């Protein structure tokens, strides 16, 4: 099916110390394959998936130098932003950045991204047309003008539609066993009496890959979203994911409800009913 | 605006000798680069740096080391100079907009097997033809510098004690008359009236960049250090 | 891959005629190219960029259109001027997968020469008074289309032509000089055969 490659960068100012913290991680779909941590001893881009270990020294040297330039750039960005928003140097602030590409099932480019947040708020983003920038405020307008004078979007396009896609394909091939697999969820339901008149039905999906999945509760075939407790899909730690959805129902009415599970690895969607 | 300075501007070295080229930049640029140009062609990247205290290999690393002691300074080091490193070296800087690089003036380095062939020019001033003067009412004086090795020279004209530019044409490149001997020529052309005036003083000056004081030199002959050599003449009726 | 190829050799062009210097390239990802110029004892400097729509960005009447299909980024100008004589570099900017770097071509030397309206060629013999028998030959005021000979005998030297400008009023004068230590042979034949 479809795939994506994403890099996630986090830089945090630390007034209490002599340097900011910078962490960069790369993912193919929901599998992390590299990391860089400004505070770690290696000072190199490190492998975090088996299939990236086959890349040679040239690769590790190049990713290391590039990521160190990212780190320096974001370090300066902290200062820049603090000045744009006239903030003191006494507080800790956060700059986040993500970029990458999506490809479809034919491994052809579908979408690209390049966006930032400051202190958890959207700062600037590349629009869907891949040619224009969304900048929410005056500060971001300043960044936008700097980028326009340097034709950043056009260069970014070359990366997003070229490099990103080509390397994503390389990775998909090299980690085929891992990356191009489909683990269908193992499902089951638990039941817990909460009171003398209500019970909790929880629908479980375990050991699935990739992370995307849909769990929905129905009552008499009617979608019950407005009353559903849904936890964040979570990592099992072995390259698979887990998730559950629960509804609180009147005791004696358990069988009126059904949990519906949708996943790529699933030929047909599953319908579960407490028995 | 953005400027970049280099030093030395010229250097004569020996095979096996240690050479250090310096570059300085106050543009607040985090990116710096060292390139080499050969026989007026090419601009090949040797080493570069993206932040103070870090250095990266370029396309032609071998025989060179680089140092980025601060944001402002970037050094190119040849530990064991070879004949192959004879070239013109250019340093540059840029900010993140790295396709626009600001270049220094360049350093001309010549590496030799031995310094004994280093020799200052012999400068001669050839006086204008009376035929030219009478037929065209102009007088072309010709300065010819010969016998010099390394071709690190600059030729200038001085008229009545002031450097002139109008009416001057000097060869862009020194000419190799031998394996160890260059020549350089220049024309200074003035009117017949101006040449015919006894008051007017014409002087050709050649600046020869040679060895520095630290270079060792025999007891035999005069050390071929950086020095100016001139030839002059005065107008005549 | 990732290379640039420029016109080889000296390109000589008469003032007033169009400049056309070729640059082709091989690029792994979408191309970004630049022309840099270096005047004689000066530093190279950026002249133009392949950006801002289709394949036409630019500087001082110089311009270049990028044609990705034939991978071309030729440098053009409508009317060459004497001041355009310089070394022109075409460079490929690589920053998609590798650390931002400019890859420079070999550079193409351009020499723009004057249209001499009323040539008055002539060869003179000049003397060095501080040296007894030392003399030199000067060829001057000739057309820019003729060819000055290259020496063919040892101990004899002839320079490439140069252009000199007398401010009085446009007196663009082409010149070449010859000399040697050969006992005796004269200025009469030295500048022969275009």
């Amino acid at each position: 099916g479809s795939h994506s490659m994403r890099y996630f960068f986090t830089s945090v100012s630390r007034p209490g110390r002599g340097e900011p913290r910078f962490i960069a991680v790369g993912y193919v779909d929901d599998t992390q394959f590299v990391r860089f941590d400004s505070d770690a001893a290696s000072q190199r881009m490190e492998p975090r998936a088996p299939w990236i270990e086959q890349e040679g020294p040239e690769y590790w040297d190049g990713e290391t130098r590039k990521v160190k330039a990212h780190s320096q750039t974001h370090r300066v960005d902290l200062g820049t932003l603090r000045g744009y928003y006239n903030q003191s140097e006494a507080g800790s602030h956060t700059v986040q950045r993500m970029y990458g590409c999506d490809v479809g099932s034919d491994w052809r480019f579908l979408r690209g991204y390049h966006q930032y947040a400051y202190d958890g708020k959207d700062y600037i983003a590349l629009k869907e047309d891949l040619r224009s920038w969304t900048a929410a405020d005056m500060a971001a307008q300043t960044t936008k003008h700097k980028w326009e004078a340097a034709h950043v979007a056009e260069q970014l396009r070359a990366y997003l539609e070229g490099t990103c896609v080509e390397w994503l394909r390389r990775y998909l091939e090299n980690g085929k066993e891992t990356l191009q697999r489909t683990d269908a969820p193992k499902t089951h339901m638990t039941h817990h009496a909460v009171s003398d008149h209500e019970a909790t039905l929880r629908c479980w999906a375990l050991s699935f890959y990739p992370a995307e999945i849909t769990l929905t509760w129905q009552r008499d075939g009617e979608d019950q979203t407005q009353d559903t407790e849904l936890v964040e899909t979570r990592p099992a730690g072995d390259g698979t994911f887990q998730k559950w959805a629960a509804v609180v129902v009147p005791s004696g009415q358990e069988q009126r409800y059904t949990c519906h599970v949708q996943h790529e690895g699933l030929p047909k969607p599953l319908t579960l009913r407490w028995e | 605006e953005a400027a970049v300075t280099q030093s030395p501007r010229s250097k004569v070295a020996v095979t096996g000798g240690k050479v250090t080229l310096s570059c300085h930049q106050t543009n607040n640029h985090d990116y710096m680069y060292w390139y080499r140009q050969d026989t007026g062609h090419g601009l090949r990247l040797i080493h570069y740096s993206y932040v103070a205290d870090s250095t990266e290999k370029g396309d032609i690393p071998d025989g060179y080391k680089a140092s980025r002691p601060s944001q402002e300074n970037f050094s190119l080091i040849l530990e064991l100079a070879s004949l192959s490193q004879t070239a013109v070296y250019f340093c540059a800087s840029s900010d993140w907009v790295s396709y626009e690089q600001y270049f220094g003036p360049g350093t001309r380095l010549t590496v030799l097997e031995d310094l004994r062939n280093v020799t200052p020019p012999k400068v001669s001033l050839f006086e204008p033809s009376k035929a030219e003067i009478a037929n065209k009412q102009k007088a072309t004086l010709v300065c010819l510098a010969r016998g010099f090795f390394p071709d690190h020279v600059e030729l200038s004209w001085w008229v009545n004690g002031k450097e002139v530019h109008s009416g001057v044409s000097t060869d862009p490149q020194a000419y190799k008359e031998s394996n160890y001997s260059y020549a350089l020529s220049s024309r200074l052309r003035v009117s017949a009236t101006f040449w015919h005036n006894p008051r007017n003083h014409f002087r050709c000056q050649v600046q020869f960049h040679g060895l520095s004081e630290e270079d060792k030199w025999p007891e035999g002959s005069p050390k071929p250090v950086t020095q100016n050599i001139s030839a002059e003449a005065w107008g005549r009726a | 891959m990732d290379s640039v190829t420029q016109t080889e050799g000296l390109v000589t062009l008469t003032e007033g005629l169009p400049v056309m210097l070729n640059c082709t390239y091989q690029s792994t990802y979408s191309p970004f190219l630049f022309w840099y110029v270096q005047h004689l004892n000066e530093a190279p400097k950026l002249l133009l960029k392949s950006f801002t729509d289709n394949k036409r960005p630019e500087h001082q009447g110089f311009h270049a259109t990028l044609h990705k299909s034939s991978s071309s980024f030729h440098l053009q100008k409508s009317s060459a001027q004497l001041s355009d004589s310089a070394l022109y570099y075409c460079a490929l900017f690589l920053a998609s997968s590798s650390f931002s770097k400019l890859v420079f071509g070999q550079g193409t030397s351009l020499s723009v020469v004057p249209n001499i309206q009323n040539p008055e060629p002539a060869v003179y013999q000049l003397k060095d008074p501080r040296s007894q028998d030392s003399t030199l030959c000067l060829f001057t005021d000739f057309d820019s289309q003729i060819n000055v000979p290259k020496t063919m005998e040892s101990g004899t030297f002839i320079t490439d032509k140069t252009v000199l400008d007398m401010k009085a009023m446009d007196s663009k004068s082409n010149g070449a000089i010859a000399w040697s230590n050969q006992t005796s042979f004269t200025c009469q034949d030295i500048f022969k055969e275009t």
Partner: peptide, 9 residues
């Protein structure tokens, strides 16, 4: 593979 161009804010 990371991008090799490094825009600033």
């Amino acid at each position: 593979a990371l991008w090799g161009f490094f825009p600033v804010l």
